[PDB]
Amino acid sequence: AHSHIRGLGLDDALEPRQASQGMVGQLAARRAAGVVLEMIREGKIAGRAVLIAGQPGTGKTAIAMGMAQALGPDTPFTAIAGSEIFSLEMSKTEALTQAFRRSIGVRITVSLHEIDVINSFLALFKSEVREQINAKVAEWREEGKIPGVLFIDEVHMLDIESFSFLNRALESDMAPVLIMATNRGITRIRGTSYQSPHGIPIDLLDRLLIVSTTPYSEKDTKQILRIRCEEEDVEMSEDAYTVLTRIGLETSLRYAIQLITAASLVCRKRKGTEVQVDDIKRVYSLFLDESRSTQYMK
Amino acid sequence: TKVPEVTRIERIGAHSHIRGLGLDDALEPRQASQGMVGQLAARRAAGVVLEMIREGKIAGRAVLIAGQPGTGKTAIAMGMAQALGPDTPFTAIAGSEIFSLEMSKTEALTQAFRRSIGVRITVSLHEIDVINSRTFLALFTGEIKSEVREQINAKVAEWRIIPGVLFIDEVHMLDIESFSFLNRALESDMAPVLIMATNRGITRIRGTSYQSPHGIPIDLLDRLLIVSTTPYSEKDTKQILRIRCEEEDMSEDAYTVLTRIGLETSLRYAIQLITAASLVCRKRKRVYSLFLDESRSTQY
Amino acid sequence: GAHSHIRGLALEPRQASQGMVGQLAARRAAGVVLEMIREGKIAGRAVLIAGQPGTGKTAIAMGMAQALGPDTPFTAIAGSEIFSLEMSKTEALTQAFRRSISLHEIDVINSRTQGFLALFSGGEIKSEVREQINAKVAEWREEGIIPGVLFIDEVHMLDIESFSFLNRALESDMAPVLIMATNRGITRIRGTSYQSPHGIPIDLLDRLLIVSTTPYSEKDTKQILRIRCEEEDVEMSEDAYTVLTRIGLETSLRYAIQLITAASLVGTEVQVDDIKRVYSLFLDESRSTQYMKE
Amino acid sequence: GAHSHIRGLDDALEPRQASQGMVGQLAARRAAGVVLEMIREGKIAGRAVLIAGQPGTGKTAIAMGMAQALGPDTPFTAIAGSEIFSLEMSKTEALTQAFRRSIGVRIVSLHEIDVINSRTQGFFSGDTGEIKSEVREQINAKVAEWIIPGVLFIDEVHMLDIESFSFLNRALESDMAPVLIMATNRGITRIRGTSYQSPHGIPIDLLDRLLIVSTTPYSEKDTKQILRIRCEEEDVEMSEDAYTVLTRIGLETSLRYAIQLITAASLVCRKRKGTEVQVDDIKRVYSLFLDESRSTQYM
Amino acid sequence: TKVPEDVTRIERIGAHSHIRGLGLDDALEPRQASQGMVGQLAARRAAGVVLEMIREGKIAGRAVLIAGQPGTGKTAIAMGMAQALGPDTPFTAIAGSEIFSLEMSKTEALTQAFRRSIGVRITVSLHEIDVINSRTQGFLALFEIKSEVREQINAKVAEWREEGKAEIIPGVLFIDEVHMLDIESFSFLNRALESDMAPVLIMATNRGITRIRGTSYQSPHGIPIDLLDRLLIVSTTPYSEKDTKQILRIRCEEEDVEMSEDAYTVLTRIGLETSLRYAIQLITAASLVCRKRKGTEVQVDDIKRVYSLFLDESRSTQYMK
Amino acid sequence: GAHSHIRGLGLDDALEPRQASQGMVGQLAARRAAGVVLEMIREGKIAGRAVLIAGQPGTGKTAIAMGMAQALGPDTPFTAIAGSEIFSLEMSKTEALTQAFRRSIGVRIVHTVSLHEIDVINSRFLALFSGDTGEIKSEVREQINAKVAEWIIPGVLFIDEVHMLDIESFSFLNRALESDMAPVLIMATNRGITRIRGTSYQSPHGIPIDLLDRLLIVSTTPYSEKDTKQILRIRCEEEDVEMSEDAYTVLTRIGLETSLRYAIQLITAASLVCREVQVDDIKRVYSLFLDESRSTQYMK
Ligand SMILES: Nc1ncnc2c1ncn2[C@@H]1O[C@H](COP(=O)(O)OP(=O)(O)O)[C@@H](O)[C@H]1O
Ligand SMILES: Nc1ncnc2c1ncn2[C@@H]1O[C@H](COP(=O)(O)OP(=O)(O)O)[C@@H](O)[C@H]1O
Ligand SMILES: Nc1ncnc2c1ncn2[C@@H]1O[C@H](COP(=O)(O)OP(=O)(O)O)[C@@H](O)[C@H]1O
Ligand SMILES: Nc1ncnc2c1ncn2[C@@H]1O[C@H](COP(=O)(O)OP(=O)(O)O)[C@@H](O)[C@H]1O
Ligand SMILES: Nc1ncnc2c1ncn2[C@@H]1O[C@H](COP(=O)(O)OP(=O)(O)O)[C@@H](O)[C@H]1O
Numbered sequence A: 001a002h003s004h005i006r007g008l009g010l011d012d013a014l015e016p017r018q019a020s021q022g023m024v025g026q027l028a029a030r031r032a033a034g035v036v037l038e039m040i041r042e043g044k045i046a047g048r049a050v051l052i053a054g055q056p057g058t059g060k061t062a063i064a065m066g067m068a069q070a071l072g073p074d075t076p077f078t079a080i081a082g083s084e085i086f087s088l089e090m091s092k093t094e095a096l097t098q099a100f101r102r103s104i105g106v107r108i109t110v111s112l113h114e115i116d117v118i119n120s121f122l123a124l125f126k127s128e129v130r131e132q133i134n135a136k137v138a139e140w141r142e143e144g145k146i147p148g149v150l151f152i153d154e155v156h157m158l159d160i161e162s163f164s165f166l167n168r169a170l171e172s173d174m175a176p177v178l179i180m181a182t183n184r185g186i187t188r189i190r191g192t193s194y195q196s197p198h199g200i201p202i203d204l205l206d207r208l209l210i211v212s213t214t215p216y217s218e219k220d221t222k223q224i225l226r227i228r229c230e231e232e233d234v235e236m237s238e239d240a241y242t243v244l245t246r247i248g249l250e251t252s253l254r255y256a257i258q259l260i261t262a263a264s265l266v267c268r269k270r271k272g273t274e275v276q277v278d279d280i281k282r283v284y285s286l287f288l289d290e291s292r293s294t295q296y297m298k
Numbered sequence B: 001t002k003v004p005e006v007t008r009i010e011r012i013g014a015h016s017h018i019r020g021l022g023l024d025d026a027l028e029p030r031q032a033s034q035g036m037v038g039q040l041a042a043r044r045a046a047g048v049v050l051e052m053i054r055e056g057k058i059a060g061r062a063v064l065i066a067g068q069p070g071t072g073k074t075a076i077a078m079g080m081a082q083a084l085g086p087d088t089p090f091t092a093i094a095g096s097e098i099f100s101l102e103m104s105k106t107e108a109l110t111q112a113f114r115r116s117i118g119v120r121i122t123v124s125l126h127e128i129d130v131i132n133s134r135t136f137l138a139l140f141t142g143e144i145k146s147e148v149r150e151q152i153n154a155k156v157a158e159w160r161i162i163p164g165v166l167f168i169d170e171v172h173m174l175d176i177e178s179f180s181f182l183n184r185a186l187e188s189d190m191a192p193v194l195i196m197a198t199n200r201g202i203t204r205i206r207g208t209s210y211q212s213p214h215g216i217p218i219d220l221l222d223r224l225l226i227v228s229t230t231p232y233s234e235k236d237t238k239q240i241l242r243i244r245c246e247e248e249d250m251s252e253d254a255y256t257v258l259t260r261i262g263l264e265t266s267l268r269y270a271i272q273l274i275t276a277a278s279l280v281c282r283k284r285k286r287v288y289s290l291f292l293d294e295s296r297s298t299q300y
Numbered sequence C: 001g002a003h004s005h006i007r008g009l010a011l012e013p014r015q016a017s018q019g020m021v022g023q024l025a026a027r028r029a030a031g032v033v034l035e036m037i038r039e040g041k042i043a044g045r046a047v048l049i050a051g052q053p054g055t056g057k058t059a060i061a062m063g064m065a066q067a068l069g070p071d072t073p074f075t076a077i078a079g080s081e082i083f084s085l086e087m088s089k090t091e092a093l094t095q096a097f098r099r100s101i102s103l104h105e106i107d108v109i110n111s112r113t114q115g116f117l118a119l120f121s122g123g124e125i126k127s128e129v130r131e132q133i134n135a136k137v138a139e140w141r142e143e144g145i146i147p148g149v150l151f152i153d154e155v156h157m158l159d160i161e162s163f164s165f166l167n168r169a170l171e172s173d174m175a176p177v178l179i180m181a182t183n184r185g186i187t188r189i190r191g192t193s194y195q196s197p198h199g200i201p202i203d204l205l206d207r208l209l210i211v212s213t214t215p216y217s218e219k220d221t222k223q224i225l226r227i228r229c230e231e232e233d234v235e236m237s238e239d240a241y242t243v244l245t246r247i248g249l250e251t252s253l254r255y256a257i258q259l260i261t262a263a264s265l266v267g268t269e270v271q272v273d274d275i276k277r278v279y280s281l282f283l284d285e286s287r288s289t290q291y292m293k294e
Numbered sequence D: 001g002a003h004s005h006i007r008g009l010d011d012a013l014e015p016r017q018a019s020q021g022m023v024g025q026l027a028a029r030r031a032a033g034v035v036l037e038m039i040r041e042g043k044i045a046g047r048a049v050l051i052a053g054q055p056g057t058g059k060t061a062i063a064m065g066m067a068q069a070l071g072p073d074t075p076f077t078a079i080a081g082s083e084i085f086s087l088e089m090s091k092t093e094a095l096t097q098a099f100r101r102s103i104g105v106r107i108v109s110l111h112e113i114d115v116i117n118s119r120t121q122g123f124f125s126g127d128t129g130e131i132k133s134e135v136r137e138q139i140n141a142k143v144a145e146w147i148i149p150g151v152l153f154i155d156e157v158h159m160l161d162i163e164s165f166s167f168l169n170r171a172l173e174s175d176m177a178p179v180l181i182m183a184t185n186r187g188i189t190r191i192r193g194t195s196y197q198s199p200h201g202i203p204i205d206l207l208d209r210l211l212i213v214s215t216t217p218y219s220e221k222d223t224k225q226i227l228r229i230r231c232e233e234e235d236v237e238m239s240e241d242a243y244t245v246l247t248r249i250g251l252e253t254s255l256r257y258a259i260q261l262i263t264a265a266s267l268v269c270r271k272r273k274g275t276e277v278q279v280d281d282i283k284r285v286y287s288l289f290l291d292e293s294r295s296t297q298y299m
Numbered sequence E: 001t002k003v004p005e006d007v008t009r010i011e012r013i014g015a016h017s018h019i020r021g022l023g024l025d026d027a028l029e030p031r032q033a034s035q036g037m038v039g040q041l042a043a044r045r046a047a048g049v050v051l052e053m054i055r056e057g058k059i060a061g062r063a064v065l066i067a068g069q070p071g072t073g074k075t076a077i078a079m080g081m082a083q084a085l086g087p088d089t090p091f092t093a094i095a096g097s098e099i100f101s102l103e104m105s106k107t108e109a110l111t112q113a114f115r116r117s118i119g120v121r122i123t124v125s126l127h128e129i130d131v132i133n134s135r136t137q138g139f140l141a142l143f144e145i146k147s148e149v150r151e152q153i154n155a156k157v158a159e160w161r162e163e164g165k166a167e168i169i170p171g172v173l174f175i176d177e178v179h180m181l182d183i184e185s186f187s188f189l190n191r192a193l194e195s196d197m198a199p200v201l202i203m204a205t206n207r208g209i210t211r212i213r214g215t216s217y218q219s220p221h222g223i224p225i226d227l228l229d230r231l232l233i234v235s236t237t238p239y240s241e242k243d244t245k246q247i248l249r250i251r252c253e254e255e256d257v258e259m260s261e262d263a264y265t266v267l268t269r270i271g272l273e274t275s276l277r278y279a280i281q282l283i284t285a286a287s288l289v290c291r292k293r294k295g296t297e298v299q300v301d302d303i304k305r306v307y308s309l310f311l312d313e314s315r316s317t318q319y320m321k
Numbered sequence F: 001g002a003h004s005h006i007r008g009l010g011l012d013d014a015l016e017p018r019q020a021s022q023g024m025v026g027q028l029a030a031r032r033a034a035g036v037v038l039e040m041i042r043e044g045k046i047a048g049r050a051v052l053i054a055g056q057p058g059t060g061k062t063a064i065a066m067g068m069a070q071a072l073g074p075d076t077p078f079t080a081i082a083g084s085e086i087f088s089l090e091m092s093k094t095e096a097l098t099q100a101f102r103r104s105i106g107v108r109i110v111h112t113v114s115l116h117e118i119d120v121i122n123s124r125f126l127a128l129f130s131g132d133t134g135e136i137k138s139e140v141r142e143q144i145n146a147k148v149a150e151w152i153i154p155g156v157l158f159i160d161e162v163h164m165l166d167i168e169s170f171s172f173l174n175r176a177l178e179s180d181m182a183p184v185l186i187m188a189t190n191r192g193i194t195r196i197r198g199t200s201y202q203s204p205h206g207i208p209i210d211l212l213d214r215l216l217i218v219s220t221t222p223y224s225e226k227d228t229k230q231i232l233r234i235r236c237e238e239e240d241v242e243m244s245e246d247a248y249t250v251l252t253r254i255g256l257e258t259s260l261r262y263a264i265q266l267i268t269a270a271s272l273v274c275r276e277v278q279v280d281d282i283k284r285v286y287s288l289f290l291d292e293s294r295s296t297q298y299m300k
């Protein structure tokens, strides 16, 4: 999904170029992310986190991926959704400690979580293990033998107790850069009867740097779609790109991206080389988007 | 000592006729073939999904069939299993089935998944779990011991199979924690094809104060291929009814009345009447007035 | 002993036979169900009797048990009974099922605290006791089990987890005939924010045969009341029967039946003044609730 | 000792206007008579009683009278529905105790035997008010080797939840169980632990097994008679004019509030170095100690 | 070796220092100002009848409910009843909300409030004896009593009472904001009233009809019918300008504060417009300001400064909105 | 280091505040009131009582609490927490609160160290991400409390967003006020009447009457253009940032239109863009990093 994102694509003066390092348009957010990167580099981001507020499919995840790439090539990047913390399989503490340990790298670069799994056939099936892993890593670091980026999408799904965990996590030196994202304005803090901007408590909000993403133009949507086709090794007609950019603007960038793979399959079945308007057309009528599926049910 | 040996949704036999999706070489549906009648678009879409699964492109994704009740959502899921192969395990459950006094939601879900992973010695992982457990002797909790599953998984790994299809109807009944389980399940290589179904538009996600399309979180929705089913015509209803009569082993005028009863109520209620009308006929309209449908029973 | 007279249900009902009076259509429908159960076609379906209270829903269930055979166990419970301080819903339900195969009587007899020794103590049967009982029954069956009828009244009181239990129970071959009853149309499924016909989930509803009961006429009410007087060995004046049939039609068949015993207590043949005294002494739900709304 | 005077509920089960402590309330007393003969002739088996009436209409008095009529040794325990909800013990314990207080052993209640043969008896300490299962198992064994079931009165029954009602229902299946007499002043109400409404807040399962008896409020003449009986019981002498004032205060408020004033007015009269309680004593005490109507309004 | 001591109670906040009894004559009739009590004639008269009822052993099985608006001497009357019952009589005042603790159960919170109200004249409370004969105790306990410890304490106290070494003196337990208690807590109070060694229970509220917590039903004062039927309800009226001034003059003496007659006028106005508690809170602060000004008598400007500095509930909530 | 400059309440001998001293700027009445509280604590009159600072966000409620700690002494521990912090997946509300209190009680060995610091040192990288919980063993605290008793400077505990605490937490604070070695409790809110959490009753500031009747309520007014500028100039010096007089005017405007906290957040970012900060640097940074008002409005 973010194969193309190779950095934030900014010049020497931390100013974004229209298309560079995989990133297309979204000038202001990429400019703001640039200031955040230099803040992280100059050691000023300490104790603070990032909130990217924007409508779905506005490169919130892409900017988080770009920040990781810009911080370094070995920098661990883990993206989770707020809802993921609520599991039948594990506690919210476990869900969160795992997301954090997946975001702290150890250059022998391997994540703390990967080291936890290795020292522990099908998902149809310990504090001590982590205590031993943390001890060996402390020994190796002292002998002289990398905190990444943690992206939390749909952050308004987290409850007050989870927010306290994130807050206490920000107090650690070895903690990764916390980047949260939402599309919500005022909402209730889960586990609370109070409303708050983005559904985040005042204590955490006061420690955040809020960045906003604007929705893409017809020209920007087409460019992102052309980049995704290259990533999936799919060739399209210029007229098919126009149809897809329209389908994307009327529905979502995610639904337009979902169609690329299906349209390529239809084109390959037709014993074809380049995906034409009729392939995108067939696939659009076959596989519904949230707007059509919910309206057909009503 | 693991010991491999059972009829599934075959016990009710409601999909006896479904022998595949009945699509040609170009993945295009024929009006009536392999038990499937009409429902061209959904069967066409299911064809693209089958080729996606075959060419290894369905990886990380699942299917959502949105449609009014009695529109072949289960039939298309049964057809996809049959099309994937003859040995392919198929298990169809309802979202509400996860909520049990007998076992946890994790157990209910791990069992539904293990019933959908076949081992070609083809027998399900769950069948192997039940056979190698301390049971009529268990007739009148329902969880399989972790140790028993650990042994079964070990012997299967040593011997090494065929991941089938898992159909979850009334999916809007599942809560946020259950959806996280399905999401994590989709990350596994040996996972079956997940096919969910609903008749709901926007609804609250259970265990949440937020509304969402089909009551599914955005995280899972973004990983789904949404297919829709349209209700059947008079001609299509009659054909499905004629297929069911053959399966259960019948005047042309009686078929006209049943096709009307089916169009005015539901295809399921019309199908329910076939067996009862046959009993009355063997003893020597009556059956419709005797056995009520949801609409009449609630109104009376 | 409210159904003492019920001795059973050409599947065409006779106006009065085997204790059953009137209720022609429902008894006719029950006949088709009995032949379905006999010919092994009722597998893995259940019955829903939808009707207003006092319309013989329990009587038809009792009649179906009697018709299936004389030995056939019959247990009638209310949905609300599953909710106990003394035992879990699983236990409450496993007991109702084991009383319908009794297997439960065998469980009680071979259990530590029983009878007076169990009378108001510090309610569940140990799993080990049931494992031993199930083993001996399996041994006896092999050396050389009659599943009965389980009636669940006020079914809309059951929650989604209890419905899952009934659903899984229907998958068993040794399971009794499940007959549920309600007087409700659309209602919320307990433990859920969704409404549904009779408060039953679609999964179970799709497996039900719905039968409906109509209320009794003046002539039908009088006949049922005359049968009950005989069963309780009570004799009444023809004028007292007229008054009771009126009291029954204005209130309920159950309240009219409740009065029979009290009028007999209140001196050879029960006259109108005895039924009159007893009516003013013992109130029915309609009058007691209206008197409180003051 | 609010029911000191109640010594029973004629030969034809017909109530006399004033006898065995009972005054007026003819119909309900008549109905209680039929219930007693039903219990005696073994017809009350599986059934219980519901007394529906406004507060202070002798619902408890009729229950006390039924116990006295059943025999002099017959145990009688009166509890309120709300009493089952305790920090000290479970609802099961609260209910098993109320039932065991209502089953007598010929020589004393089963509960009294449970307390005597239990450790913690001494004498605002810890600690659960529950009796050990083993202690009850030993007591039940000795009693089985060697029983007078009394009356259990449950007031404010609409306070019980669905699980508690299932306990009462299962209790009615026992042969050694006491006569269950419930009471309420409510019409249709929600069954606690349920989203459904029902007559008296009782489930249909239990309601279908109940004999509903209703109590009407007392007249000026009946209120005065009950108040005269209570004054004698508490050994309090009043002026005929003070009885008129109290009967008025009782009719405007409640019979319980009027009866509460008898003791306080006697204290004021004794302080005034008096013999007979006069109108001014009942008047002082009425203005000092408030009733629900005045306390809620003045609050 | 069970070890008894006393300790300062509601005396630590000292708001009822002056309350030395109910100030009633031989005929149980209140004098306008006596034993610290000022005005509130009817409630004090009613409390007198309750005292004679407790003394003549007639209060048995019953409790008191004082219904009145905040700052109408509900706590003062409870304090006065304790003082009137005797000088050694333990008095503990709690709020309904205090039963809800992260540190202990509602049962513990309530058993402690009751054991703080039963004195042992070797006079020391049963709770104080529980603390002294418990593992940690004070600073060693700094950031529930064991059942065994209470079982031993109860045994020794029973033995000493029988021998004639000790005398158990049941005091007064005041429960303010009683409508905060739930149905289970009310059942505890009800069962407590059945004990012979139980203290006099005095509850208080400012509420009329309210829901019983843990219930969907409304009820007078948020108390169930079972307990209500066992209560003697007393009501308190709000104070006049003359009564407010007198209470304030008594508090100034108690805190050893001298005020100008004009400053008393301002404070009596501030008290009538806000609350008697807020006016009393200002006495200490105004004295501090006056002492800082190198002053002798607290004047209008001292009360004025302090009023604008320290807000009352009405102003603070309005400024926030 | 948001309160680096706060070195005391900046009051004269007569407990009267000087416009700008000991880091404190303006807020004369609240600083004056805090002075009376300090002398009340010193003269032993604050016994059993706590402080409530009611004011809109960014009105120096935390600064006045920091100033009170500094005024009480140089060794005096100061811990500031938010009500919401008590609700943790890592520890109980009791633990959260006992830790906040033990962080506020100093032990002067000559050096002062908190009771909590002594608890951590004498208890069994990267601990927040290790497992873990969070809580300190009762036995460890029992030993630490014993040795400290054998061999105490109570500080200040500031609880912001106090209306987030439930009735059980308020009972903890109430019982904590009964201890002699307890710190000065300073609570703060911006709310008028609100429900007490864990209750169906509304109350001023969401605090029960029992605790409210024991509080000394102090109010903070919002800052003027002249006061805002001065606080911002002090913060720039603390962060070693140089601004143009025109840039200070823009920042004072941005602060008055949004919040003092948002204006302070910009100082660091504007310095980074600059690397003397001019109006164009503050302008760029304002358009890049949004404040709560703009971010929520853009999302709607
Ligand atoms: N500015 C951008 N440049 C390049 N790719 C982008 C850009 N914005 C979005 N994309 C791509 O579009 C898809 C959806 O974007 P995403 O980052 O997930 O947005 P959001 O988190 O706001 O929903 C991804 O494949 C992502 O890499
Ligand atoms: N297109 C179809 N061709 C043949 N049988 C069908 C078709 N659609 C539905 N059926 C049959 O009708 C019955 C009810 O259909 P079902 O698939 O369960 O509906 P739903 O969409 O609600 O799951 C089943 O016996 C099913 O096999
Ligand atoms: N068809 C009938 N024939 C004889 N008795 C009947 C008939 N219908 C009802 N009764 C009797 O009337 C009483 C109440 O009927 P019941 O079966 O409990 O109905 P329901 O379950 O609908 O409330 C019982 O004593 C029952 O035996
Ligand atoms: N019929 C009666 N005869 C004598 N005393 C009665 C009678 N009815 C009520 N009382 C007395 O009046 C008082 C209150 O009556 P009670 O039985 O408690 O009624 P309820 O339970 O309906 O509130 C008691 O002292 C009771 O003994
Ligand atoms: N009648 C009175 N005489 C003397 N002091 C009183 C009187 N009424 C109230 N007080 C005092 O006023 C203050 C607040 O009164 P309080 O008893 O707490 O009232 P309440 O419990 O109704 O809120 C206390 O310091 C109390 O001693």
Ligand SMILES: Nc1ncnc2c1ncn2[C@@H]1O[C@H](COP(=O)(O)OP(=O)(O)O)[C@@H](O)[C@H]1O
Pocket: F002, F003, F004, F006, F023, F024, F025, F026, F027, F055, F056, F057, F058, F059, F060, F061, F062, F063, F064, F231, F235, F260, F261, F264
């Ligand atoms: N009067 C003041 N003097 C100096 N700095 C102040 C003053 N008021 C606020 N500040 C500073 O402004 C910032 C925000 O103020 P803060 O104390 O956190 O207010 P609040 O708690 O009301 O939100 C902090 O950096 C704080 O030190």
